[PDB]
Structure formats: C-alpha cells, structure tokens
Amino acid sequence: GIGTFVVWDYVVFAGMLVISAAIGIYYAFAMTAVPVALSLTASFMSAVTVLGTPSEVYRFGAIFSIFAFTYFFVVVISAEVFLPVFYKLGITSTYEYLELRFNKCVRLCGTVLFIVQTILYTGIVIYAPALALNQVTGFDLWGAVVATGVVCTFYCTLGGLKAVIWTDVFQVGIMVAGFASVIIQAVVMQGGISTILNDAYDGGRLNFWNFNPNPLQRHTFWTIIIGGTFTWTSIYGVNQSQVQRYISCKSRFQAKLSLYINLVGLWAILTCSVFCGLALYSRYHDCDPWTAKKVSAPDQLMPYLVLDILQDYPGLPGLFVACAYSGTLSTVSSSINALAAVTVEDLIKPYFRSLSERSLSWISQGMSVVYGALCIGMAALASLMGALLQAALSVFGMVGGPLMGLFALGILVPFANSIGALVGLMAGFAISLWVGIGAQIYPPLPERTLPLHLDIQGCNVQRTPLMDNWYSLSYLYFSTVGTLVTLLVGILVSLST
C-alpha cells in the first residue's frame, strides 16, 4: 500500500519532543571543546539540512557532495584568520568588536544586518518541519507554523536561555537514530548499497564533476569551492550565534580544535543526507512523488519516503518527524533570545536610559513576543522563495555576505577608515540585495540550473539581457558578489581619505 501514521507512533513523536523540553527545563530550573563542537553541530543539524538536502540531491544531482571540501575550506579560514582576532582581544560578542575597529555608529549599522538575517533564517527553521508535518498528517500547512511559533515564544521564559550540553546531545542522539532508521531500511528494501549506487548512475544523479568556469551556472565545482566558502565563512566566522561559543571555550588551542571536530560532524550529516538523496531516487525512479501521487513542496520528499518505507514498522516513522522537529526547539528559542538581549542592549543608549529594572525585565519579554510575530510573519513569507535550501543559503549570502565584508575590511586591511566602511557596507548590501531579489523574482532558466529528469511514466519578449546575464547568477555567489564589492568600495573610499 502506501502507509500513514497510526495511533501508536503519534505519541512517539510527541514523547521524544517533550523529553527534550524536559532536559531543558530541569537544567534551567535547577568548555573543554568536546561539548561546544557538538553544540556547533546541532546548529548545523537543522530541519533545513535534514529535510531539504536529500530533496535537492534527488533533483539537481549529487554535485552537493563537493561541499565536503567547502566545509573544509571554511574551518581553515575561520580558525586561522577570524578566530585569533575575536579571542586574543578579549571580545565579549563579535559585534562589540566593530566599535573598536570603527566608530560606534557602524555597530548599530552592523547588528541591524544581523536582525534581518536572523528573522529571515528562523522563518525557514520554522516553516520547513511544518512543511513535513503537513505531509504526514494532513493537519494544515498554515496552522502548524503558528503551532510551532507559539511554543518557542513561551519557551522564552528563561528556558531557552543558558543552553546546556544535555539538550544538544539529544538533537544528534535522535538524528543518529533518525537517519539510521531511514538509511538501513532503504538498503534492505532496495537490495544492497551497490543497487542504490547503480540506478542513481543510470539516472545521472552522480554528477560529481562539472568544472564549468562561468558564474551563471548554478552548481559547478567552482561555485561550490569559491562561492560556497564565502557563504559559509559568513556563518562560521562572523555570525554572532556561532562565535559566542568560540570565545566561551577556555583554552585558545581547544577553541580552535572545536572548529576542527565538527568538520567530522559536518562530513557525517552531509554523507548521511546525500546518501538519503540517492536512496530517494532509486525508490522512485519509476513514479516520482511529484507529478503523480503528489506532495505539494519538493521538501515533502523525505517524509513521504519514511511512511512508504517504515509503514510496516510502527513507532519508527514518528522518529523521523521527531528529528526534523528536534532541531527547531533549540534553534528558534536561542534565535529569539539572541534577538532579545541584543535589541535591549541596542535600545537603552538612545532611550531615556534611566528606567528601573522592572521595565527592563518587562521589555526583555516585551520584544520577545514581537520578534516571534516577526518569526511567524517571515515564516509565512517562506511559503514562497522556492526550494528552502536554495533560500536558506541565499539569505546567508545576500544579507550576511556584506556583513562578513566589514570583518574582512577590519582585520586584514590596516587602513580601513570608519567613514569608508559605512558607505562600503551600504554599497555592498545594495548590490547583494539587487542580485538576491532579482533571482528570487525571476528564476534562472533550466539551462543554467541544470535540473535532472523525474520520469512520470512507470507509475502503475519575456527575457531581457539583465534578467538573463546577471539575475541568473549562482545562488552561492550572492556573498562573493557582496564581499568583493564592500572590500573594493570599502578600500577606495578609505583610500580617498
């Protein structure tokens, strides 16, 4: 048949979710580099890189395997270059560094880029597993979003703050059982790894080497190496949520090592999700779940597989919806509390600044409900924007790209004038938002994105030369064309003075 949820595994999804909340509430109501490296993996192990990485390898080939070198070229850069600067100066948080190297105005111009990047990303951490819960249950797609949003805004009652190791080992601990449920049963349903790796070659899904040296193609070897490094350096080098847990480590050699331990963990989640993408093709190289036996979104290709493969095993398809949901309760509550304490630290200095602690403790939970509405409101926007991995790396590239340019202009260039960086940032943020929205309004043609076949069978003038030659830029180049503008513009204005 097809297989769906039963009454017995529904509690398995709810029971594994509440115990993760039970670990968090006990240590709240109560760094030696091995915990914080696993806590650095749990931020990577979101519902974007579990639900959407197989559905993207299944459609656009396994060129995504070249990211295993991209994950190596970012942890080399983010440990040699960006790590000894934020550590040896005794920095508390990486946006306080910007008023040390430049004036205080660019820090308020810096964290406003962080807020628009965060609320655009945390709408994709929320909407993606709600796009999975709508598939397995048919609940509703717009109601499961506001279901997920209100349980994290009420988790801002000092439960989401003070992140513990024990609520982060459970994220991987379910996810090491979530993939091993779906990898192992897919091999025995298809008869060997050498059968999964045989129909994928006949479908053209291998696709490991492209080497085409033009930026207009979406996935090359050069886009993933050059442009993909500049995207992920904006996450592991300058993003405040992933530098706060580098300074908090005690020894400088250990904090460097924590960035080198999760490189194994990033290589694990990439290999265990690319191989789910090749498993997802060999199961459906006759009747895809698109075009027939439909799933609304492309990101409903992993939860459609799980109820198709684990239908005769009760208990286990609730575990796959659990590990998609397990990442969000740690991410979004920390995502909101990162937006909470930074905003009230930003707000008090142009305010009256002499209010009492009763209003300040009120406004810490005053804006936390406001941002959760902006978390929900941007999650309704994320029903657009497409593939939800292409959109999760664009809003890292098109917004957080030029933000990485300031730290490149500050650290490397010794003569960065502060009036040069402020007009350098807003020039770079304008070029990236020009190409970043131009691609998401007019998508690239399929001769540049190269999507693969889907095989519906065996189931028993418009273009203008700006829209074609620059809006078809690769989505991993929205930070290269952002950083290499605010480094060029940021120097020549500084060179003018």
């Epitope: 070659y201 479908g203 696709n207 190289h285 698109w290 399929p446 999507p451 076949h453 095989d455 065996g458």
Partner: nanobody, 122 residues
Framework: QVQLQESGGGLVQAGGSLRLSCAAS????????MGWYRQAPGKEREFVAS???????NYADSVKGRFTISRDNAKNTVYLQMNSLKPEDTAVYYC????????????????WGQGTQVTVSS
C-alpha cells in the same frame, strides 16, 4: 552538461535512404525521452519525433510511416532512419533530449546538440 554528439548525414540521392546516429555522453539519464528536431533554412524549429523509455514512438503528420526511429538503452543513443527522401525536406538536424523536471506543463528543457546537414540531389 551531457555534451552529446551525432553523425551520419550528408549529400544523398533524392529518394534513397539514410540512418542518422546520435550518441550521448556525460551523466545523461537513461529514461529521458530523446528526440529529433530539425531547422529548415529561414524557418522555425520543426517537428518532434520523440521516443521515451517505453518506446512510445511519435511522429508528425507530414512524416508518418516514411520515417522511423528507434533507440537502445544500453549505450544511450538514438537512430533516426530515412526513407522516401523528398527534394525539399533537406535541412539541418538537431538531436534533443527532453528532460522533465517538475509538475507543471511548461517546464522542459532540451540539451540541444550540434547540427548535421543533409542534402538531396534531384
């Protein structure tokens, strides 16, 4: 990406026979639905002769019966074969492979190969 090539075409007698071959290198999907388009001088991209993985063979109304086409899935190639060559059906011929990548109707792209000119005499 697929970088496909072709051969088998040139000057023949008007009324004879010919077999046009077309290989397909790269990481081309086998269950693809390769086809055969042509372009007359000064005209538009002309008919499709599509053959899918299930060998459901299609023709245009001008070329029913007189032309035939068959593929084999072992080497990913297609053979377009000619009979009853008219004095005016001469054109350049392209070897397309119609990918389908989505649920809608207007989402297909073609991977056009290089041309091959076939001419007649009388």
């Amino acid at each position: 990406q697929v970088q496909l090539q072709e051969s088998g075409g040139g000057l023949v007698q008007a009324g004879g026979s010919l077999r046009l071959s077309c290989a397909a290198s790269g990481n081309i999907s086998t269950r693809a639905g390769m086809g055969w388009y042509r372009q007359a001088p000064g005209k538009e991209r002309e008919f499709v002769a599509s053959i899918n993985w299930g060998a459901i063979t299609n023709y245009a109304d001008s070329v029913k019966g007189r032309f035939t086409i068959s593929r084999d899935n072992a080497k990913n190639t297609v053979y377009l074969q000619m009979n009853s060559l008219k004095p005016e059906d001469t054109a350049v011929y392209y070897c397309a492979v119609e990918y389908k990548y989505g649920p809608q109707r207007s989402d297909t792209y073609y991977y056009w190969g290089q041309g091959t000119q076939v001419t007649v005499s009388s």
